[PDB]
């Protein structure tokens, strides 16, 4: 219904677009209790998370959180250029809401 | 390391992608080994140049952009548009002067040639050349893998002496270093078509083995999306 | 049962075939609440979505919607040429019902 | 237990082997209601489906239907040569029961 | 707990290690009823199955059986050299319990 | 929330960071009952496991254990450099809690 990631971001409070136009520099993944998450960085040091699933997520988001972590791993290993990230900026690191690749 | 090689070619990027790379003459796809072309470095290096050398199962490159441009201007004049492909080093690449030694036919050209062609993933990108003028902008290839190819170099000459492809009666096979690497039926071996058949089969085996490494790198990345638990 | 995407598309109301014969130019995916979707774009501007699962979908479609986003993602990443898309032309962006890939 | 696809095929009455020895020419996938299925073709025109899950399938086949769609997509994208297909031929297109891959 | 495949295999009766150091020659999978399984071969004729899930398995193995079939498909398509297979030798074909890949 | 693997590791007892800056030398995977696990080694002989899931893992970890086995299998095949592993050292071999890949 939004046609692109910028319009999607504008539908939510506490978000912003980061324009990276760069491949992921590092990919980190944890299975440790209460920290079942992924973190990625870019060569400029920008750091981002896919949050641990929690009470801030509705049920429909659970499959999507898993899909995002799958997308970040393949994007890292194929050196895919990421165009933009939409994130919640009230989290540290900023938490990924959406990704675009072009 | 991250050294690059360069090749002028009239074939455009879309065709390169469909072909699986920059292919030798007669070969329409990299991995599709249905019809098996001749692989012979000596024959390849001696081939005549309206194309930059790409016959007999290898594709030639230069060691700098300027060198490849100058060659492009010599050989591809009268293509209003051509491309200079920027190519990573990897162990499918042979330094022709090193492998053929004093029998390298065009040693001033300092050519480096890829056995079986240059897979798409080994292509960093390309410049467009319009009426001989290099466009300033390098177009980057999405199929390229930098960490992979920047950790690799060209084949050492010792891996190529046995593939040099000299005729059985050529004196190279009786000289160092090739005498230590001569295929069956070549050189001082009794009654030196065996030599050429063995050059061919050794080249096919090299390419089979090399192709397994490309498949492993590229097709494993293509399968790094699988999430088991989501199906379990 | 249909033999191809064009015959499949014709079994449905408010559908049409788009013919791209091109790789996907952009792939966007979202996990934001109520916007768990994907969007693709082609270099000619054409834009399509995989709809957020909802009341318009039957149960047997849920796994297929997940599969389609997986397919679009890997098609994008591998630069696979997409032949045709069957889409519902009563959504903006048009909603993907089916994809065919071919060279 | 069968040791190859021909022998496996022979354990069922309504199946046959097709020998292709060729890569897949097109891969088509649908999320449209009642047609949640995949279709493949080869360059000679031979066309095959992975059927929509139905009353003909036992519970153990459900996961395997999904696996087969995974298999065909990645086989398509990697240009892997398909040796043989075992199919049910009381359906059109012929419905895939098994696949063998070899060069 | 074991630190390698040989030690892991040794924990079970009716097992043995095959040292292959070779890529998979052929990959076969089936969604046919009661034969939901995978079969691989090597160029020397050696043939191995991943068993149909059944009462010889405990519930925790179910997820690993599915993972193993994926591992074998991936290995096949990538021409990855398989180092060793741990198998049960009281089945024909020998049934895979574990796989190692090295380099 | 931690911003990197070193800070994440510091949150846990009986945990250690190994700096490898190397690709995985071997990957082993098992479906044998009570040994549904993975083992990796590095060329210097360092050996690590993904543990068999059990009551030392909270429910939320179950999915993540499966993800880590997916990640290790494909990191091995793509020869991806692993920067660091966060591991529990109250197990032999040390058990993986987290992985970072860079360079
Ligand atoms: O198990 C799948 C098969 O089931 C049979 O009953 C049916 O006749 C076949 O066409 C095929 O669908
Ligand atoms: Na290199």
XYZ file of C-alpha atoms and ligand atoms in Angstrom:
759
model
C 0.000 0.000 0.000
C 2.972 2.304 0.458
C 4.920 1.886 -2.783
C 8.390 2.232 -1.306
C 10.383 2.114 1.910
C 10.372 5.888 2.522
C 6.564 6.093 2.461
C 6.359 2.955 4.611
C 8.645 4.537 7.235
C 6.514 7.684 7.378
C 3.574 5.529 8.508
C 5.222 4.825 11.877
C 6.242 6.901 14.866
C 9.885 6.968 15.987
C 11.358 5.862 12.668
C 13.846 7.175 10.162
C 15.469 6.203 6.869
C 19.192 5.501 6.746
C 20.571 5.620 3.222
C 23.574 3.366 3.057
C 24.107 2.343 -0.584
C 26.682 -0.207 0.624
C 27.091 -3.873 1.380
C 27.057 -5.141 4.908
C 30.491 -5.174 6.575
C 29.762 -7.497 9.487
C 27.061 -9.968 10.420
C 26.640 -11.147 13.999
C 24.129 -13.745 15.213
C 23.367 -14.991 18.763
C 21.384 -17.928 20.180
C 22.050 -16.939 23.779
C 18.993 -16.783 26.060
C 17.149 -13.430 25.870
C 19.551 -12.241 23.117
C 18.307 -14.242 20.129
C 19.090 -11.495 17.674
C 21.227 -10.358 14.762
C 23.390 -7.305 14.512
C 24.912 -5.883 11.350
C 27.447 -3.137 10.711
C 28.577 -1.079 7.814
C 32.100 -0.046 7.031
C 31.356 3.508 8.264
C 30.516 1.958 11.677
C 26.716 2.259 11.449
C 25.246 -0.537 13.525
C 21.734 -2.041 13.434
C 19.758 -4.801 15.104
C 16.908 -7.122 14.411
C 15.285 -7.095 17.832
C 14.678 -10.068 20.032
C 11.003 -10.936 19.581
C 8.996 -9.501 22.431
C 5.848 -7.902 23.715
C 6.449 -4.908 21.420
C 5.700 -7.208 18.467
C 2.295 -8.423 17.287
C 1.928 -12.047 16.200
C 2.068 -11.244 12.479
C 5.525 -9.786 12.983
C 7.084 -13.001 14.320
C 7.495 -14.677 10.902
C 8.715 -11.436 9.461
C 11.448 -10.990 12.106
C 12.760 -14.452 11.124
C 12.596 -13.531 7.437
C 14.579 -10.350 8.080
C 17.376 -12.269 9.777
C 17.444 -14.666 6.799
C 17.608 -11.680 4.404
C 20.463 -10.071 6.290
C 22.541 -13.294 6.230
C 22.103 -13.818 2.468
C 22.677 -10.118 1.797
C 25.929 -10.307 3.803
C 27.195 -13.520 2.123
C 26.312 -12.340 -1.423
C 27.662 -8.841 -0.852
C 24.335 -7.273 -1.860
C 24.264 -3.518 -1.801
C 21.734 -2.259 0.674
C 20.032 0.966 -0.416
C 18.043 1.975 2.672
C 17.060 0.808 6.073
C 13.950 1.944 7.885
C 14.564 1.715 11.641
C 13.080 2.549 14.994
C 15.419 5.151 16.425
C 14.200 4.797 20.007
C 16.260 1.635 20.319
C 20.045 1.152 20.590
C 21.290 -0.008 18.264
C 18.617 1.302 15.864
C 16.168 -1.543 15.154
C 15.412 -2.615 11.607
C 11.835 -2.254 10.426
C 12.425 -2.620 6.698
C 15.195 -2.998 4.121
C 15.518 -2.032 0.515
C 18.088 -3.299 -1.958
C 18.611 -1.829 -5.432
C 45.110 -10.125 -3.402
C 42.739 -7.613 -5.022
C 44.725 -7.118 -8.253
C 42.655 -6.588 -11.369
C 42.952 -7.637 -15.001
C 41.227 -5.939 -17.939
C 39.732 -7.044 -21.249
C 38.170 -5.094 -24.105
C 35.180 -6.943 -25.541
C 32.271 -5.994 -27.881
C 29.931 -8.435 -26.080
C 27.705 -6.358 -23.751
C 27.073 -6.996 -20.060
C 23.600 -8.524 -20.580
C 25.120 -11.183 -22.888
C 27.993 -11.808 -20.493
C 25.461 -12.424 -17.729
C 23.421 -14.823 -19.913
C 26.606 -16.660 -20.879
C 27.826 -17.074 -17.256
C 30.807 -14.850 -18.053
C 33.281 -13.887 -20.796
C 33.482 -17.102 -22.771
C 35.973 -18.582 -25.226
C 34.960 -18.770 -28.872
C 32.254 -21.345 -29.560
C 31.162 -21.710 -25.934
C 27.701 -20.284 -25.086
C 27.615 -21.024 -21.327
C 30.277 -21.482 -18.654
C 28.948 -24.542 -16.734
C 27.061 -26.125 -19.642
C 29.801 -28.465 -20.779
C 27.718 -30.360 -23.328
C 29.945 -29.630 -26.331
C 33.567 -29.714 -25.184
C 35.806 -27.196 -26.971
C 39.570 -27.513 -27.493
C 41.591 -26.295 -24.496
C 45.222 -25.523 -25.454
C 47.226 -22.579 -24.110
C 49.877 -22.630 -26.854
C 47.242 -22.636 -29.621
C 45.302 -19.937 -27.742
C 48.302 -17.622 -27.297
C 49.214 -17.871 -30.997
C 45.701 -17.120 -32.181
C 45.223 -14.163 -34.489
C 43.519 -10.927 -33.485
C 38.518 -8.485 -34.802
C 38.420 -9.994 -31.273
C 40.812 -10.004 -28.322
C 42.321 -13.510 -28.158
C 39.668 -15.956 -26.942
C 40.130 -19.186 -28.951
C 41.169 -22.666 -27.932
C 39.418 -22.605 -24.608
C 41.034 -19.562 -22.947
C 40.180 -15.872 -22.752
C 42.972 -13.327 -22.672
C 43.283 -10.244 -20.496
C 45.749 -7.373 -19.934
C 47.402 -6.285 -16.682
C 46.201 -2.658 -16.835
C 43.251 -0.578 -17.928
C 45.468 1.489 -20.219
C 46.923 -1.640 -21.852
C 43.438 -3.089 -22.415
C 42.154 0.221 -23.783
C 45.104 0.504 -26.191
C 44.377 -3.028 -27.330
C 40.705 -2.211 -27.599
C 41.583 0.733 -29.858
C 43.795 -1.500 -32.026
C 41.425 -4.484 -32.360
C 37.892 -3.219 -31.743
C 38.109 0.027 -33.778
C 34.853 0.119 -35.712
C 32.680 -0.957 -32.840
C 31.109 2.387 -31.896
C 30.536 0.942 -28.430
C 32.580 -1.648 -26.573
C 33.279 -2.560 -22.984
C 36.367 -2.939 -20.938
C 35.696 -5.582 -18.315
C 37.530 -5.359 -14.980
C 38.407 -8.844 -13.758
C 39.633 -10.283 -10.492
C 42.659 -12.563 -10.289
C 42.014 -16.218 -9.443
C 43.749 -19.562 -10.027
C 42.036 -20.108 -13.389
C 44.377 -17.415 -14.790
C 47.788 -18.128 -16.273
C 50.606 -15.701 -16.977
C 51.235 -16.652 -20.620
C 54.875 -15.413 -20.682
C 55.631 -17.511 -17.607
C 53.909 -20.726 -18.754
C 55.175 -20.628 -22.389
C 58.503 -19.018 -21.519
C 60.699 -18.143 -24.475
C 58.001 -19.609 -26.712
C 55.415 -17.010 -25.707
C 54.472 -15.561 -29.127
C 53.585 -12.012 -28.079
C 55.553 -11.399 -24.877
C 55.340 -7.574 -25.026
C 51.572 -7.965 -24.617
C 52.033 -9.425 -21.091
C 48.797 -11.414 -21.385
C 47.064 -13.329 -18.615
C 44.595 -15.949 -19.863
C 41.709 -17.687 -18.167
C 41.267 -21.390 -18.737
C 37.640 -22.008 -19.626
C 36.729 -18.329 -19.735
C 35.971 -15.799 -17.014
C 32.946 -16.596 -14.906
C 30.534 -13.735 -14.263
C 31.293 -13.720 -10.524
C 34.974 -12.941 -11.262
C 33.918 -9.790 -13.115
C 34.230 -6.714 -10.927
C 32.548 -4.389 -13.359
C 32.862 -2.684 -16.697
C 33.559 0.588 -18.459
C 31.735 1.629 -21.623
C 33.898 2.875 -24.476
C 32.126 5.113 -26.961
C 33.966 6.031 -30.158
C 37.204 5.143 -28.377
C 36.450 7.378 -25.383
C 36.427 5.692 -21.993
C 33.404 6.669 -19.969
C 34.644 7.820 -16.553
C 32.022 5.731 -14.705
C 32.799 2.148 -13.701
C 29.595 0.048 -13.640
C 29.856 -2.422 -10.770
C 28.768 -6.064 -11.264
C 26.270 -7.333 -8.711
C 27.396 -10.946 -9.388
C 30.928 -10.140 -8.182
C 32.278 -11.382 -4.852
C 35.053 -9.224 -3.488
C 36.026 -11.042 -0.296
C 36.251 -14.298 -2.221
C 38.296 -13.098 -5.192
C 40.481 -10.678 -3.222
C 41.751 -13.640 -1.238
C 42.894 -15.419 -4.428
C 45.679 -14.890 -7.028
C 46.506 -16.212 -10.502
C 47.697 -19.773 -10.915
C 51.421 -20.249 -10.284
C 53.302 -21.189 -13.466
C 54.053 -24.647 -11.992
C 50.315 -25.431 -12.315
C 50.435 -24.425 -15.984
C 53.651 -25.969 -17.419
C 51.818 -29.318 -17.811
C 49.027 -27.525 -19.651
C 51.312 -25.522 -21.921
C 49.932 -27.415 -24.897
C 53.022 -27.547 -27.098
C 52.933 -30.146 -29.921
C 54.649 -33.433 -28.978
C 57.624 -32.660 -31.233
C 58.168 -29.157 -29.777
C 61.578 -28.795 -28.104
C 60.003 -27.202 -25.002
C 59.048 -30.685 -23.816
C 62.764 -31.549 -23.773
C 63.784 -28.438 -21.840
C 63.360 -27.222 -18.280
C 60.948 -26.629 -16.805
C 58.423 -28.400 -19.075
C 60.342 -31.663 -19.301
C 59.379 -32.324 -15.674
C 55.679 -31.731 -16.451
C 55.257 -33.189 -19.983
C 51.968 -35.069 -20.607
C 52.072 -38.678 -21.755
C 53.148 -39.038 -25.397
C 55.018 -35.725 -25.453
C 58.689 -34.961 -25.808
C 61.081 -37.767 -25.005
C 58.204 -40.184 -24.359
C 58.115 -43.077 -26.884
C 56.881 -42.149 -30.422
C 55.659 -38.646 -29.475
C 47.892 -38.159 -31.036
C 48.374 -39.012 -27.356
C 50.164 -35.793 -26.407
C 47.309 -33.607 -27.727
C 44.586 -35.886 -26.277
C 46.275 -35.707 -22.877
C 46.725 -31.949 -23.028
C 42.990 -31.821 -23.732
C 41.965 -34.198 -20.914
C 44.267 -32.487 -18.413
C 42.671 -29.171 -19.307
C 39.142 -30.598 -18.970
C 40.009 -31.991 -15.538
C 41.491 -28.652 -14.480
C 38.322 -26.859 -15.597
C 36.039 -29.453 -13.880
C 37.893 -28.923 -10.648
C 37.923 -25.163 -10.974
C 34.214 -25.071 -11.828
C 33.429 -26.981 -8.625
C 35.004 -24.119 -6.661
C 32.956 -21.462 -8.447
C 29.738 -23.442 -7.957
C 30.558 -23.889 -4.301
C 31.093 -20.213 -3.683
C 28.269 -18.777 -5.770
C 25.573 -21.463 -5.277
C 26.212 -21.677 -1.507
C 25.545 -17.945 -1.238
C 22.349 -18.541 -3.262
C 21.248 -21.027 -0.579
C 22.103 -18.955 2.511
C 18.439 -17.859 2.777
C 17.176 -21.276 3.960
C 15.609 -21.208 7.438
C 15.055 -24.747 8.640
C 12.992 -23.980 11.704
C 10.344 -22.123 9.713
C 9.602 -25.457 7.914
C 10.271 -27.750 10.897
C -4.970 -27.402 -13.927
C -3.158 -24.611 -15.823
C -0.081 -25.339 -17.998
C 1.441 -21.902 -17.593
C 1.074 -18.559 -15.859
C -1.062 -17.031 -18.534
C -3.684 -19.817 -18.303
C -3.555 -19.622 -14.461
C -4.093 -15.864 -14.449
C -7.205 -16.291 -16.604
C -8.925 -18.436 -13.924
C -9.263 -15.303 -11.752
C -11.220 -12.029 -11.840
C -9.430 -8.671 -11.651
C -6.107 -10.154 -12.869
C -3.709 -9.430 -15.726
C -0.333 -10.563 -17.030
C 2.671 -8.249 -16.964
C 5.593 -9.214 -19.166
C 8.958 -7.950 -17.987
C 11.649 -10.270 -19.371
C 13.978 -8.474 -17.001
C 15.610 -8.770 -13.634
C 14.111 -7.094 -10.586
C 15.556 -3.611 -10.054
C 14.676 -3.317 -6.345
C 13.482 -5.523 -3.502
C 12.015 -4.145 -0.285
C 10.820 -6.117 2.669
C 9.199 -5.003 5.912
C 8.516 -6.479 9.321
C 6.640 -3.469 10.656
C 3.284 -4.321 12.295
C 0.457 -4.427 9.728
C 3.044 -3.925 6.921
C 4.655 -7.417 6.787
C 4.997 -7.297 3.002
C 7.460 -7.141 0.142
C 7.638 -4.701 -2.761
C 9.554 -5.098 -6.014
C 10.298 -2.602 -8.744
C 11.532 -3.007 -12.331
C 13.776 -0.552 -14.138
C 10.821 0.712 -16.204
C 9.075 1.857 -12.998
C 6.641 -1.077 -12.665
C 5.927 -1.750 -8.967
C 4.288 -4.799 -7.368
C 3.611 -6.039 -3.840
C 3.190 -9.277 -2.034
C 0.191 -8.433 0.094
C 0.149 -8.529 3.877
C -1.724 -11.720 4.884
C -5.344 -10.912 5.562
C -9.030 -11.730 5.285
C -8.778 -11.820 1.469
C -6.601 -14.970 1.751
C -7.601 -18.548 2.531
C -5.487 -20.724 4.874
C -3.813 -22.689 2.050
C -2.423 -19.386 0.733
C -0.468 -18.475 3.872
C 2.503 -20.730 3.161
C 2.451 -19.699 -0.505
C 2.622 -15.995 0.374
C 5.725 -16.767 2.477
C 7.211 -18.822 -0.378
C 6.558 -15.985 -2.906
C 8.512 -13.444 -0.836
C 11.342 -15.986 -0.646
C 11.198 -16.406 -4.411
C 11.206 -12.679 -5.090
C 14.146 -12.196 -2.729
C 16.319 -14.827 -4.396
C 15.240 -13.758 -7.876
C 16.380 -10.261 -7.015
C 19.645 -11.350 -5.420
C 20.616 -13.702 -8.310
C 19.485 -11.249 -11.022
C 17.250 -13.936 -12.467
C 15.240 -12.737 -15.421
C 11.563 -12.568 -14.617
C 9.357 -13.477 -17.559
C 5.830 -12.669 -16.419
C 3.871 -11.775 -13.300
C 0.167 -12.514 -12.798
C -1.269 -9.717 -10.675
C -4.481 -8.362 -9.239
C -5.008 -4.997 -10.919
C -7.432 -3.784 -8.201
C -4.684 -3.106 -5.657
C -2.018 -0.411 -5.607
C 0.603 -1.476 -6.018
C -0.707 -4.364 -8.107
C -0.629 -7.573 -6.047
C 1.288 -10.629 -7.205
C -0.622 -13.839 -7.667
C 2.089 -15.726 -9.624
C 5.558 -15.424 -11.161
C 7.310 -17.140 -14.050
C 11.027 -17.073 -14.614
C 12.712 -18.002 -17.866
C 15.526 -16.975 -20.116
C 13.643 -49.647 -0.057
C 14.426 -48.468 -3.599
C 17.990 -47.569 -4.536
C 17.089 -45.279 -7.447
C 14.164 -43.323 -8.958
C 13.236 -45.930 -11.595
C 12.812 -48.585 -8.930
C 10.863 -46.229 -6.672
C 8.582 -45.323 -9.559
C 7.863 -48.991 -10.197
C 6.257 -49.349 -6.725
C 3.255 -47.198 -7.813
C 0.613 -48.081 -10.415
C -0.236 -44.649 -11.837
C 3.362 -43.359 -12.329
C 5.926 -43.195 -15.115
C 9.517 -42.043 -15.567
C 10.409 -39.199 -17.874
C 14.027 -38.907 -18.885
C 15.080 -35.314 -19.459
C 18.857 -34.957 -18.879
C 18.388 -31.222 -19.195
C 18.137 -28.082 -17.083
C 14.766 -26.536 -16.312
C 13.717 -23.956 -18.928
C 11.053 -22.123 -16.863
C 9.934 -22.071 -13.250
C 6.482 -20.759 -12.329
C 4.990 -20.409 -8.881
C 1.531 -19.316 -7.689
C -0.018 -18.172 -4.364
C -3.486 -17.744 -5.836
C -6.284 -19.443 -3.891
C -6.760 -23.120 -4.893
C -3.739 -22.903 -7.210
C -0.914 -22.862 -4.681
C 1.405 -24.785 -6.954
C 4.550 -24.804 -9.039
C 5.021 -25.524 -12.731
C 8.226 -26.311 -14.587
C 8.960 -26.647 -18.263
C 11.826 -27.900 -20.322
C 12.953 -26.513 -23.676
C 11.267 -29.377 -25.586
C 7.936 -28.202 -24.130
C 7.601 -30.955 -21.487
C 5.576 -29.466 -18.606
C 5.217 -30.693 -15.004
C 3.531 -29.523 -11.772
C 3.922 -29.912 -8.117
C 0.297 -30.305 -7.151
C -1.714 -28.185 -4.815
C -1.866 -30.165 -1.512
C -5.118 -32.109 -1.365
C -7.187 -35.055 -0.153
C -5.038 -37.393 -2.242
C -1.988 -36.594 -0.064
C -1.212 -38.211 3.239
C 0.156 -36.111 6.106
C 3.728 -37.299 5.491
C 3.616 -35.916 1.959
C 2.836 -32.360 3.046
C 6.410 -31.445 4.049
C 7.791 -33.276 1.028
C 5.582 -31.233 -1.364
C 7.104 -28.093 0.132
C 10.625 -29.565 -0.162
C 10.068 -30.387 -3.827
C 9.086 -26.783 -4.560
C 12.252 -25.649 -2.802
C 14.253 -28.142 -4.883
C 12.852 -27.107 -8.239
C 13.361 -23.385 -7.610
C 17.045 -23.772 -6.702
C 17.563 -26.347 -9.458
C 16.176 -23.757 -11.863
C 18.344 -20.929 -10.571
C 21.536 -23.011 -10.559
C 20.827 -24.514 -13.989
C 21.205 -28.011 -12.520
C 20.657 -30.826 -14.979
C 17.569 -32.905 -14.231
C 18.126 -36.584 -15.059
C 14.671 -38.110 -14.488
C 11.252 -37.261 -13.108
C 8.827 -39.801 -11.631
C 5.269 -38.476 -12.175
C 1.621 -39.365 -11.692
C 0.119 -39.251 -15.179
C -3.559 -39.235 -14.182
C -3.095 -35.434 -13.853
C -2.337 -32.698 -16.416
C 0.278 -31.402 -16.274
C 1.931 -34.594 -15.110
C 2.411 -34.347 -11.350
C 5.888 -34.758 -9.863
C 6.428 -37.594 -7.402
C 10.214 -37.568 -7.464
C 13.268 -36.063 -9.090
C 16.772 -37.260 -9.825
C 19.644 -34.895 -10.571
C 22.958 -35.953 -12.135
C 25.260 -34.586 -14.810
C 29.960 -35.425 23.707
C 31.828 -36.285 20.499
C 34.249 -33.898 18.776
C 34.184 -35.548 15.348
C 32.110 -37.787 13.108
C 34.092 -40.948 13.785
C 33.576 -40.630 17.526
C 29.919 -39.776 17.026
C 29.328 -42.779 14.799
C 31.061 -45.080 17.343
C 28.332 -44.311 19.900
C 25.853 -46.374 17.864
C 25.652 -50.057 16.961
C 25.214 -51.141 13.357
C 27.104 -48.129 12.084
C 30.185 -47.498 10.054
C 32.069 -44.620 8.457
C 32.507 -44.369 4.715
C 35.403 -42.153 3.686
C 34.485 -40.655 0.314
C 36.445 -37.419 -0.113
C 34.344 -36.758 -3.225
C 31.384 -34.730 -4.433
C 27.948 -36.306 -4.750
C 27.327 -37.859 -8.183
C 23.506 -37.878 -8.060
C 20.704 -36.588 -5.835
C 17.175 -38.064 -5.755
C 14.206 -36.928 -3.651
C 10.679 -38.237 -3.443
C 7.334 -37.022 -2.149
C 5.563 -40.286 -3.031
C 3.400 -41.694 -0.269
C 5.373 -43.726 2.235
C 8.609 -43.097 0.291
C 9.296 -39.500 1.414
C 13.062 -39.850 1.261
C 16.339 -38.823 -0.376
C 18.881 -41.004 -2.132
C 22.441 -39.986 -3.062
C 25.138 -41.763 -5.010
C 28.841 -41.364 -5.635
C 30.715 -42.045 -8.865
C 32.011 -45.399 -7.572
C 28.445 -46.742 -7.198
C 28.077 -46.183 -3.449
C 24.446 -45.374 -2.615
C 22.991 -43.896 0.601
C 19.510 -42.888 1.806
C 17.996 -40.545 4.290
C 15.272 -42.721 5.733
C 11.566 -42.107 5.550
C 10.671 -40.804 9.044
C 9.200 -43.693 11.044
C 8.933 -45.469 14.421
C 12.703 -46.151 14.440
C 13.204 -42.434 15.016
C 12.591 -40.354 18.155
C 10.743 -37.047 17.867
C 13.930 -34.950 18.116
C 15.336 -36.674 15.031
C 12.445 -35.508 12.814
C 13.801 -31.974 12.462
C 17.324 -33.346 11.810
C 16.117 -35.657 9.057
C 14.698 -32.622 7.233
C 17.888 -30.663 7.808
C 19.970 -33.562 6.479
C 18.044 -33.730 3.227
C 18.659 -30.007 2.749
C 22.361 -30.461 3.522
C 22.599 -33.172 0.881
C 20.805 -31.050 -1.751
C 23.036 -28.095 -0.991
C 26.185 -30.233 -1.128
C 25.063 -31.793 -4.419
C 24.343 -28.470 -6.122
C 27.560 -26.854 -4.923
C 29.716 -29.882 -5.818
C 31.069 -29.777 -2.269
C 33.436 -32.641 -1.385
C 32.014 -34.816 1.285
C 34.662 -36.111 3.609
C 32.842 -38.832 5.531
C 29.403 -40.309 6.042
C 28.347 -42.090 9.239
C 25.672 -44.608 8.247
C 23.608 -47.461 9.621
C 24.673 -50.584 7.788
C 21.587 -52.625 8.687
C 19.572 -50.856 6.014
C 19.811 -50.940 2.235
C 20.814 -48.521 0.995
C 22.942 -47.657 4.039
C 21.140 -44.952 5.977
C 22.813 -41.636 6.777
C 23.257 -40.690 10.426
C 25.886 -37.975 9.933
C 27.974 -36.148 7.361
C 31.274 -34.310 7.466
C 32.681 -31.826 4.964
C 36.263 -30.494 5.165
C 38.273 -27.614 3.586
C 21.160 -4.229 24.172
C 24.739 -4.993 23.067
C 26.199 -3.495 19.864
C 28.745 -6.227 19.161
C 29.676 -9.833 19.987
C 32.228 -8.925 22.668
C 29.739 -6.861 24.653
C 27.081 -9.586 24.185
C 29.447 -12.253 25.520
C 30.166 -10.113 28.616
C 26.481 -10.446 29.607
C 26.839 -14.201 30.279
C 28.584 -16.445 32.823
C 31.072 -19.167 31.756
C 31.498 -17.586 28.392
C 34.616 -16.742 26.338
C 35.447 -14.910 23.067
C 37.716 -16.744 20.650
C 39.193 -14.565 17.944
C 39.634 -16.738 14.859
C 39.728 -14.415 11.810
C 39.568 -17.545 9.681
C 37.178 -19.639 7.597
C 35.780 -22.858 9.022
C 37.894 -25.888 8.170
C 35.205 -28.580 8.677
C 31.483 -28.828 9.251
C 29.824 -31.941 10.640
C 26.115 -32.486 11.150
C 24.271 -35.380 12.840
C 20.683 -36.623 12.881
C 21.411 -39.558 15.203
C 19.062 -39.750 18.187
C 20.236 -37.666 21.167
C 23.078 -36.316 19.023
C 21.165 -33.928 16.775
C 24.011 -31.443 16.604
C 26.663 -29.707 14.554
C 30.430 -29.537 15.057
C 32.889 -27.184 13.373
C 36.669 -27.086 13.383
C 39.282 -24.550 12.409
C 42.577 -25.451 10.812
C 44.430 -24.808 14.060
C 42.397 -27.658 15.593
C 39.912 -25.530 17.534
C 36.643 -27.488 17.859
C 33.122 -26.160 18.654
C 29.600 -27.546 18.872
C 26.092 -26.326 18.513
C 24.541 -28.214 21.409
C 21.738 -30.753 21.131
C 18.664 -28.772 22.206
C 17.521 -29.486 25.770
C 16.266 -28.007 29.013
C 19.426 -25.836 29.304
C 17.827 -23.836 26.512
C 14.752 -21.625 26.989
C 12.011 -21.977 24.338
C 13.121 -18.824 22.539
C 16.513 -20.362 21.988
C 15.150 -23.360 20.060
C 14.651 -21.402 16.865
C 18.031 -19.762 17.277
C 19.865 -23.045 17.621
C 18.350 -24.089 14.284
C 19.395 -20.765 12.749
C 22.972 -21.181 13.944
C 23.254 -24.603 12.335
C 21.944 -23.027 9.112
C 24.528 -20.214 9.442
C 27.464 -22.509 10.153
C 26.694 -24.892 7.293
C 26.618 -22.076 4.794
C 29.503 -20.073 6.302
C 31.578 -23.222 5.862
C 30.524 -23.634 2.241
C 31.017 -19.941 1.296
C 34.367 -19.941 3.139
C 33.217 -16.873 5.032
C 35.806 -15.518 7.487
C 34.653 -15.866 11.051
C 35.891 -13.020 13.173
C 34.898 -14.175 16.668
C 32.940 -16.884 18.380
C 31.293 -16.390 21.739
C 31.192 -19.740 23.453
C 30.335 -21.418 26.701
C 33.388 -23.091 28.201
C 31.575 -25.248 30.789
C 31.138 -27.786 27.915
C 33.542 -29.872 25.786
C 33.822 -29.005 23.078
C 33.034 -25.338 23.798
C 29.440 -24.551 22.790
C 28.629 -21.708 20.456
C 26.476 -18.857 21.787
C 27.205 -16.311 19.025
C 29.237 -15.770 15.852
C 30.544 -12.678 14.076
C 31.623 -12.711 10.455
C 33.629 -9.864 8.927
C 36.406 -9.549 6.319
O -0.006 -38.971 -3.593
C -0.276 -38.219 -4.772
C -1.063 -39.014 -5.832
O -2.286 -39.481 -5.279
C -3.081 -40.294 -6.140
O -4.276 -40.718 -5.489
C -3.488 -39.488 -7.373
O -4.230 -40.344 -8.218
C -2.232 -38.974 -8.075
O -2.601 -38.136 -9.135
C -1.335 -38.195 -7.107
O -1.979 -36.972 -6.833
Na 42.367 -11.962 -6.661
